[PDB]
């Protein structure tokens, strides 16, 4: 019912992030950010809880040389909650999902940001820890 608030975005196109699931992929090469219109010379960038297109540069052979939708769950750029706390994680990590939203994998390693959790309910179910 409530769309996500604007948060700082620190993952432009061309960033490789950890893949925190059991799909076998170990990398996620951000390809483009869904819902981004952009302007001249402006790289599309993604933050926590944003669906992106990604390719696997290191992992199971059948997951490579292909384009997968993915969702970013942890970022290292500090972002400001509306309650006034600046939060940033240890690493940039995401999971592989399809267009509908449910994960391709089954479990998530490490914490999951609250912004991702309340926006993608299916990921929150598998999230071991929150925020």
Partner 1 sequence: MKVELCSFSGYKIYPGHGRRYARTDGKVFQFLNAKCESAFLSKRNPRQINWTVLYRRKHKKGQ
Partner 2 sequence: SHRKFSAPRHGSLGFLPRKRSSRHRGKVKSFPKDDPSKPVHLTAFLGYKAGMTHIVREVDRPGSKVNKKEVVEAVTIVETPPMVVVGIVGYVETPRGLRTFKTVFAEHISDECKRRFYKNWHKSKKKAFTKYCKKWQDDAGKRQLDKDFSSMKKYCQVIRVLAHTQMRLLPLRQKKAHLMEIQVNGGTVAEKLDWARERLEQQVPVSQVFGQDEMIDVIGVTKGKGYKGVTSRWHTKKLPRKTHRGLRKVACIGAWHPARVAFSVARAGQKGYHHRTEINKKIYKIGQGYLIKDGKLIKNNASTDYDLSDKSINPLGGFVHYGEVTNDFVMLKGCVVGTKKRVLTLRKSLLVQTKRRALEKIDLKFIDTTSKFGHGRFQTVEEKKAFMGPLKKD
From 35, 37, 41, 62, residue interacting with Mg ion (rule: CB under 5 A)? 41
Q: Find how far residue 46's CA is from the centre of its chain.
A: 8
CA distance linking residue 97 with residue 55, whole number of Å: 12
Q: How many residues does the chain have?
A: 131
From 62, 86, 100, 106, residue interacting with RNA (rule: CB under 7 A)? 86
Burial level of 82, CB count in 10 A (0-12/13-18/19+)?
A: exposed
Q: Running DSSP on this structure, what letter comes out for residue 125?
A: H
User: How near is the Cβ of 108 to RNA at its closest, in Å?
Assistant: 19
Residue 124 contact, options partner 1, RNA, partner 2, none, Cβ 5-8 Å cut-off depending on partner type = none
User: How near is the Cβ of 7 to partner 2 at its closest, in Å?
Assistant: 13
From 19, 50, 70, 92, residue interacting with RNA (rule: CB under 7 A)? 92
CA distance linking residue 39 with residue 45, whole number of Å: 12
Q: Judged by CB, which is closer to partner 2: 2, or 61? A: 2
Residue 57 contact, options partner 2, RNA, partner 1, none, Cβ 5-8 Å cut-off depending on partner type = RNA
């Amino acid at each position: 019912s409530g769309a996500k608030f604007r948060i700082s975005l620190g993952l432009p196109v061309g960033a490789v992030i950890n893949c925190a699931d059991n799909t076998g992929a170990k990398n996620l090469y951000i390809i483009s950010v869904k819902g981004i219109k952009g302007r001249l010379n402006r790289l599309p960038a993604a933050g926590v809880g944003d669906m992106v297109m990604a390719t696997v540069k290191k992992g199971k052979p059948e997951l490579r040389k292909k384009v997968h939708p993915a969702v970013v769950i942890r970022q290292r750029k500090s972002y400001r909650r509306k309650d006034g706390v600046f939060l940033y994680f240890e690493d940039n990590a995401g999971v592989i999902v399809n267009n509908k939203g449910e994960m391709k994998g089954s479990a998530i390693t490490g914490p999951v940001a609250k912004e991702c959790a309340d926006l993608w309910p299916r990921i929150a179910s598998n999230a071991g820890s929150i925020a």
